[PDB]
Design a protein around this ligand. Structure first.
Ligand code: NI
Ligand code: NI
Length: 325
């Protein structure tokens, strides 16, 4: 009498092909077959498979298999146990147990283990803060090629944290990490060149490294590069490229970039002027904590008719919702 409205409807209706299957169960059984025969490489792979399920039961099985691998003296298994104990993942948190496993792994040349140890000394989590120990363990990890450790040492020499400030040494560490694709190191190295702190500003190098970090999705680097194109710093001035990169940063919810893009639309910089879009970007910026955007939005209201203001406020909500870090 009304249940004629219960028929299924497209989306939850339609013939099923290979798109609806999943390889998960098959990959687990393939890995389990080998892991249950004692193959340590398979035990490490299977532990990582379980790790990736992000469930409490998944982390408990990850722990079981890293343990089997670590009992064969495998440094990946030892690192895995170290990290699980250190964070209380799949097992009760214990920093001292974690340190024992990390040290075994690092002695075998696992650079993430050396990094984790250095980080605990750096921050005093589980052990007493000791910047000398942090420095030594980070240096071990960096000499094994670990980009995060190289980055961390860059930060320490650039800030003088437990070492005397040395921007040249910082730039050398950052560049090792930057050459491996570490986007935050590329950003920091770009800034060192931008700033002149190395002796004389090198804006071409700054823009080069900001572009690398921007291509990897770093919103600060996208803002910085957009700004380089606005000024013609180390690249030829291009308002069109400035808009392109500013829009990328603003679509990550970066309030500073949203406000700047609002200015571009307000004043017709690299784009045709559009008060509706300008107001919407200032609104998103304000919603994201950029206080100066609020008055930017206020000032625009004065010159916008009520239809446009309504559309702008709705678009501003859309931009707030859809653009996140
Ligand atoms: Ni009915
Ligand atoms: Ni009906």
């Amino acid at each position: 009498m009304h249940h004629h409205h219960h028929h299924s409807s497209g989306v939850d209706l339609g013939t099923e092909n290979l798109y609806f299957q999943s390889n998960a169960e098959k990959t687990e059984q393939l890995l389990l077959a080998s892991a249950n025969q004692g193959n340590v490489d398979a035990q490490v792979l299977l532990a990582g498979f379980y790790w990736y399920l992000n469930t409490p039961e998944g982390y408990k099985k990850a722990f079981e298999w890293y343990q089997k691998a670590a009992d064969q003296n495998n440094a990946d298994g030892q690192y895995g146990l170290g990290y699980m104990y250190d964070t209380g993942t799949g097992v009760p948190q214990n920093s001292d147990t974690a340190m024992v496993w990390y040290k075994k792994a690092a002695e075998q040349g696992n650079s993430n283990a050396a990094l984790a140890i250095g980080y605990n000394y750096d921050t005093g989590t589980g052990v007493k803060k000791d910047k000398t120990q942090a420095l030594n363990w980070y240096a071990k990890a960096a000499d094994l090629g670990n980009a995060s450790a190289q980055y961390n040492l860059g930060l320490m020499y650039e800030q003088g944290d437990g070492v005397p400030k040395d921007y040249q040494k910082a730039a050398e560490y950052f560049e090792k990490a930057a050459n491996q694709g570490h986007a935050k190191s590329q950003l920091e190295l770009g800034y060192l060149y931008d700033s002149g702190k190395l002796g004389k500003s090198d804006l071409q190098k700054a823009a080069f490294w900001y572009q690398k970090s921007a291509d990897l999705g770093n919103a600060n680097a996208q803002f910085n590069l957009a700004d380089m194109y606005f000024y013609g710093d180390g690249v030829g001035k291009s308002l069109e490229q400035s808009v392109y990169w500013m829009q990328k940063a603003a679509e990550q919810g970066y309030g500073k970039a949203q406000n700047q893009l609002g200015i571009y639309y307000r004043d017709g910089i690299g784009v045709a002027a559009d008060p509706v879009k300008a107001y919407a970007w200032f609104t998103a910026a304000k919603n994201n904590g950029f206080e100066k955007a609020a008055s930017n939005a206020s000032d625009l209201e004065k010159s916008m008719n009520p239809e446009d203001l309504s559309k702008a406020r709705i678009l501003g909500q859309q931009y707030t919702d859809n653009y996140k870090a």
